[PDB]
Amino acid sequence: NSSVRHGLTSAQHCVWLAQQLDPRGAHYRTGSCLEIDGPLDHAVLSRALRLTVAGTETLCSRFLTDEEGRPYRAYCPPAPEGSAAVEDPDGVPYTPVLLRHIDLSGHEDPEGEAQRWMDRDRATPLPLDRPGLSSHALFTLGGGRHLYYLGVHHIVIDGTSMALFYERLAEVYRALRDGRAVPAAAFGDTDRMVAGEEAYRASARYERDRAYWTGLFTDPEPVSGRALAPTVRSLGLPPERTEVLGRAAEATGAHWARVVIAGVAAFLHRTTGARDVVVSVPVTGRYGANARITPGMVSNRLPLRLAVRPGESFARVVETVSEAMSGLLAHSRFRGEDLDRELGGAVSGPTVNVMPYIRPVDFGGPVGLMRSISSGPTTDLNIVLTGTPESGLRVDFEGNPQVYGGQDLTVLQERFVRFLAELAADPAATVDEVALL
């Protein structure tokens, strides 16, 4: 139904408000891609995309305002497959669906050229009142290799949902190629997920969480302006370099993402001398079965306050992270932006985003591996990891361009990785004694 006014999630309200401060800006454009190791049929994949979008409410939506100016979400189905119509018979715009095909096979540096293309696209503003807030391109790179680019407005798609989209696209593609019925879209309902958030705000737990978070930061100013689209520098680490993180996880008993967060806390402590370190951690903000399967934007960012005292081993820092994360998860439903609103002023540190495992995407032979292009805007620094210690990592340092140049990030990144690796190689060692020239 086209006249129904859908409620925004908390995260979507937050993005909406931020967008109004810079109406024509592109700072909330984000993107990812799949590096695909075998040939795909663009014509079939284009059909697959239309069908994928048609069953993904968030990729069919536009944002409008009531008379008070308050936003709501409106659903705009695409036109039927084959149809060229732009509006339905009642004047409701159809969500356009376009899969660009960019053949770079005869190019000197297909990869580099595709990256420059994605960066140009990420700098393109998408007005929120026009349905279909995404941008798609299939690159042909020669040798039967492809790149699928998914560019979005952050208000419609979070990191979790990117994986949901890629899984669904491939599933649809496989069916179309096999000539099977396309399996039914098994996505959840955004309205129910929003209703869940509303129930939480109305519940006692909200006040408990509020007390908890205000309690922890009643007193600290963030240490290194507006949030801007980052300059992104990316570093590939093969398994030979990353396996050590897995060994550190095994030995400390902590998940490897915690080892990385401990690593960042250690790095900040050594770089700046502060014992009161803060890093921000994204959580998915998805609670319950329906929410876990609803493409959309519900992610939350929460500050992690970590005491790093002199003489401590790296294993002790991992425990500090563990202790702090336990509190954060137990009160995870409280919105980071509401915590900031309460405290006033500017609380945050570098975002440390260790993305969860995503199985390689299967197109029926060809296999797609996901990599981040830009995860979101930043006042300072996002650290984004994709991969696993066993399979290798991609490490992205995403820096506010007023704060960092590309070269600053490369140097920072290289120093951090070498420091993390040596910490991980011996968690018993005192952090302060670990040589970092």
Ligand X SMILES: *CCCCCNC(=O)[C@H](C)N
- For ligand X, the binding residues (CB under 6 A) are 11, 14-15, 18, 154, 282, 299, 301, 337, 351, 375-376
Q: Where are the alpha helices (DSSP H) in 60-109?
A: none
Smaller CB separation from ligand X, 154 or 168:
154
Work out the number of other CB atoms within 10 angstroms of the CB of residue 404.
22
CA-angle at 52, arms to 197 and 384, nearest 5°:
60
β-pair partners for 299: none
> Amino acid identity, residue 193?
M
Smaller CB separation from Cl ion, 32 or 231:
32
* Least distance CB 19 / ligand X (angstroms): 9
Is the CB of residue 321 less than 8 Å from the CB of residue 366? no
Please name which of 401, 397, 367, 377 lies closest in space to residue 385, comparing C-alpha atoms. 397
Which residues make Cβ contacts (< 8 Å) with residue 30, sequence separation at least 6?
122, 151, 152, 153, 154, 157, 373, 374, 375, 376
* Least distance CB 299 / Cl ion (angstroms): 4
* Least distance CB 213 / ligand X (angstroms): 15
Smaller CB separation from ligand X, 13 or 50:
13
Nearest residue to ligand X, using CB?
Answer: 376
What is the C-alpha to C-alpha distance for residues 157 and 365, in angstroms, rounded to an integer?
27
Smaller CB separation from ligand X, 403 or 436:
403
* Least distance CB 113 / ligand X (angstroms): 26
Smaller CB separation from ligand X, 15 or 99:
15
* Least distance CB 347 / ligand X (angstroms): 14
List the single partner that 301 binds among Cl ion, ligand X, none, CB under 5 to 8 Å by kind.
ligand X
What is the C-alpha to C-alpha distance for residues 120 and 124, in angstroms, rounded to an integer?
7
Which residue do the tokens 């308050």 mark?
A: 70
List the single partner that 31 binds among Cl ion, ligand X, none, CB under 5 to 8 Å by kind.
none
> Amino acid identity, residue 332?
S
List the single partner that 49 binds among ligand X, Cl ion, none, CB under 5 to 8 Å by kind.
none
What is the C-alpha to C-alpha distance for residues 257 and 385, in angstroms, rounded to an integer?
9
* Least distance CB 34 / Cl ion (angstroms): 17
Bridge-based pairing state of the strands 134-142 and 231-237: unpaired
Which residues make Cβ contacts (< 8 Å) with residue 189, sequence separation at least 6?
290, 294
Smaller CB separation from Cl ion, 159 or 296:
159
Is the CB of residue 12 less than 8 Å from the CB of residue 297? yes
Smaller CB separation from Cl ion, 159 or 387:
159
Smaller CB separation from ligand X, 138 or 381:
381
Token output for 171? 């599933």
Q: What is the dihedral of CA 413, 31, 404, 357, to 10 degrees?
A: -20
Smaller CB separation from Cl ion, 158 or 197:
158
List the single partner that 368 binds among ligand X, Cl ion, none, CB under 5 to 8 Å by kind.
none
Smaller CB separation from ligand X, 13 or 174:
13
Q: Enumerate binding residues for Cl ion (CB under 5 A).
A: 158-159, 299
* Least distance CB 159 / Cl ion (angstroms): 4
Length reported for the chain = 437
List the single partner that 337 binds among ligand X, Cl ion, none, CB under 5 to 8 Å by kind.
ligand X
3-state secondary structure of 283: strand
List the single partner that 18 binds among ligand X, Cl ion, none, CB under 5 to 8 Å by kind.
ligand X
What is the C-alpha to C-alpha distance for residues 82 and 94, in angstroms, rounded to an integer?
13
* Least distance CB 337 / ligand X (angstroms): 5
Which string of DSSP letters, residue by residue, matches 370-392? EEEEE---BSSEEEEEEEETTTE
Element at 393 (helix H, strand E): strand 392-399
* Least distance CB 416 / ligand X (angstroms): 19
* Least distance CB 348 / Cl ion (angstroms): 15
Element at 316 (helix H, strand E): helix 314-330
